[PDB]
Design a protein around this ligand. Structure first.
Ligand SMILES: COc1cc2c(c(OC)c1OC)-c1ccc(OC)c(=O)cc1[C@@H](NC(C)=O)CC2
Ligand code: NA
Length: 128
């Protein structure tokens, strides 16, 4: 009777949202996102959590601000962001969602931690 569904994905396109192309946002796409996207642990993070497919009916009860690298990649390619901080916040939301939903010893958490370490190493060099 009652089907579980996924929420609409986060907005990747809004012509009326203020947006800029900055050196920092270019670095976030060409260096930061590119590095994490190709990482051996990227696969769970390359698209919204599909709670229907993965049989996680509780995921979107716990995680109220979903984020993932597929969304971030589209945002960067679509010039969705006003500043680097908005994009950094999306990465932080993605990692934090994983830590919140799962338990500290879990494989998925180990994966997120490795991606986060690389992320922090790259944003240490954010230009400007
Ligand atoms: C049945 O197979 C899978 C099922 C899930 C996940 C997953 O990717 C590792 C799977 O492998 C395809 C899974 C995926 C993504 C998550 O966040 C990105 C998450 O928090 C959490 C998960 C999963 N939880 C854990 C502790 O790995 C639950 C659902
Ligand atoms: Na947790």
């Amino acid at each position: 009777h009652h089907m579980s569904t996924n929420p609409p994905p986060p907005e990747t396109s809004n012509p009326n949202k203020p947006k800029r192309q900055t050196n920092q946002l270019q670095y976030l796409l060409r260096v930061v996102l590119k590095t994490l996207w190709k990482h051996q642990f990227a696969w769970p993070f390359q698209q919204p959590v599909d709670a229907v497919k993965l049989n996680l009916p509780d995921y979107y009860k716990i995680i109220k601000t979903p984020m993932d690298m597929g969304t971030i990649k589209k945002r960067l390619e679509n010039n969705y962001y006003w500043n680097a901080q908005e994009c950094i916040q999306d990465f932080n939301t993605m990692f934090t969602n994983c830590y919140i939903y799962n338990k500290p010893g879990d494989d998925i958490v180990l994966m997120a931690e490795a991606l986060e370490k690389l992320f922090l190493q790259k944003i240490n060099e954010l230009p400007t």
